[PDB]
Amino acid sequence: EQESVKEFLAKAKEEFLKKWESPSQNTAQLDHFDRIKTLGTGSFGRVMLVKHKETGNHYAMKILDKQKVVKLKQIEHTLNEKRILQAVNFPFLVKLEFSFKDNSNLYMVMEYVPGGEMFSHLRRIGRFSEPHARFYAAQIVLTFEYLHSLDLIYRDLKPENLLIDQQGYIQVTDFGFAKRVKGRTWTLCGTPEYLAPEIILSKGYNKAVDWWALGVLIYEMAAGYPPFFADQPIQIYEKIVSGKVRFPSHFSSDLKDLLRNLLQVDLTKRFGNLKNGVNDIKNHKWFATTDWIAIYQRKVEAPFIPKFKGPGDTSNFDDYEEEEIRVSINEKCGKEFTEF
Ligand SMILES: NC(=O)c1ccccc1
Ligand SMILES: NC(=O)c1ccccc1
């Protein structure tokens, strides 16, 4: 690799480790914000559009219920999420601006991206052309090069976690499954359609699972649907481990070849996990038109720009029941979340 890239990644790791070793804590509080709208929901939390009352800035606030995190055995994962997010810095990662906790909840306040999820745009248009899919894929390749060099595995690549910003670039959100890992890790987590075979088979796995997920994402972007689909998860898992994928006829030969090497069931043969690491992907003929430095510098004109009216527009997100956000008079799970 060019020394310029080596030195960049050395500095990136230095800066990450300084924040990793001394995480920021308790940098705002709930009554600093006005609640605007629910942007998304899950089994143990929600994401809200909020406005800071003194500055007028909008943010997306992820709120996790401590008692539900405990019950759903997500304690370590939520601590990972916040500790990693407060320590990273890359053009295609959403920025965490504040974090704090109270008697009931954990709070992560991040930059609001009004363009919405790639998922919505993909389903609205049907599929992306190869150039369009390649523009997004290149950003994920660089983001994984960054994360993996910090010994981080992402573990939740899917279109819902990729927001499209005002310049049409990706900002990856939701680090709920991200983890700092030297060697292997074992937790069953992710989203079924995107799981690598070695996760399904309960092996000790590594960063190669992210490269598998990139194969799934590129396939889904270019086809309009993911390569392994079924009504039951077990049926999805049978397809994933089988080593069989069918490509639409409109796929280019270069795209098929790249995907066979990312969707390689044998992790020891999968692109991104060989001796040349990420460069087997960056040098593949499907990426021959990609100017990697220009992508990093956000100098490439994007395939499209989401339509939105301003930093408070929620039109690109959908409508959810507006539920109360209660804070108990008594502290819950204090010990479990001491480090948050
Ligand atoms: N009540 C509040 O201050 C609040 C602010 C933001 C989100 C939810 C609640
Ligand atoms: N950062 C955001 O704008 C965001 C929006 C919705 C869900 C998650 C994050």
- By most ligand atoms within 8 Å of CB, the mutation choice from 112, 308, 315, 318 for ligand 2 is 112
Q: Rounded distance, CA 238 to CA 195, Å?
A: 11
Atom of ligand 1 nearest to the CA of 34: 5
Q: Please provide residue 38's backbone torsions phi and psi, each rounded to the nearest 5 degrees.
A: -80, 125
Atom of ligand 2 nearest to the CA of 112: 3
- Annotated binding-site residue numbers: 39-47, 62, 111-117, 158-161
Q: Where are the alpha helices (DSSP H) in the chain?
A: 3-21, 66-71, 75-85, 118-125, 130-149, 197-200, 208-223, 233-242, 253-262, 279-282, 292-296
Classify residue 339 by its DSSP letter. Answer: T
Atom of ligand 1 nearest to the CA of 50: 6
How remote is the CA of residue 285 from the centroid of ligand 2, in Å?
34
Which residue, by CA, sits nearest to atom 8 of ligand 1? 35
The binding-site residues of ligand 2, defined as CB within 6 angstroms of any ligand atom, are 39-40, 47, 60, 94, 110-113, 163, 173
Taking only Cα atoms into account, the Rg of the chain, rounded to an integer number of angstroms, comes to 20
**Hey, what are 319's tokens?**
């409508």
Paired residues of 93 in beta bridges: 172
How remote is the CA of residue 136 from the centroid of ligand 2, in Å?
18
Q: Rounded distance, CA 95 to CA 107, Å?
A: 14
Q: Rounded distance, CA 53 to CA 320, Å?
A: 24
Told to judge if 156 belongs to the known catalytic residues of this protein, a careful annotator would answer yes
Which residue, by CA, sits nearest to atom 6 of ligand 1? 35
Q: What is the dihedral of CA 133, 49, 319, 165, to 10 degrees?
A: -20
Ligand 1 in contact with 324 (CB < 6 A)?
Answer: no
How remote is the CA of residue 31 from the centroid of ligand 1, in Å?
6
Q: Rounded distance, CA 146 to CA 140, Å?
A: 10
How remote is the CA of residue 23 from the centroid of ligand 1, in Å?
24
Residue 35 buriedness (CB in 10 A; 0-12 / 13-18 / 19+): middle
Residue in this structure with the two tokens 């939740």, named with its chain if needed: 156
Which residue, by CA, sits nearest to atom 9 of ligand 1? 35
**Hey, what are 177's tokens?**
């499954």
**Hey, what are 273's tokens?**
């996990």
User: Whose CA is closest to 13, among 120, 114, 148, 122?
Assistant: 148
Ligand 1 in contact with 30 (CB < 6 A)?
Answer: yes
Strands 45-52 and 96-101: unpaired
Which residue, by CA, sits nearest to atom 4 of ligand 1? 35
Cα three-residue angle 214-216-221, rounded to 5 degrees: 90
How remote is the CA of residue 268 from the centroid of ligand 1, in Å?
48
Atom of ligand 1 nearest to the CA of 48: 7
- Annotated binding-site residue numbers for ATP: 39-47, 62, 111-117, 158-161
Q: Rounded distance, CA 222 to CA 45, Å?
A: 31
Classify residue 330 by its DSSP letter. Answer: S
168: left (phi over 0), alpha (psi -120 to 50) or beta: left
Method: X-ray
CA distances from 173 to 16, 57, 63 (A): 18, 19, 14
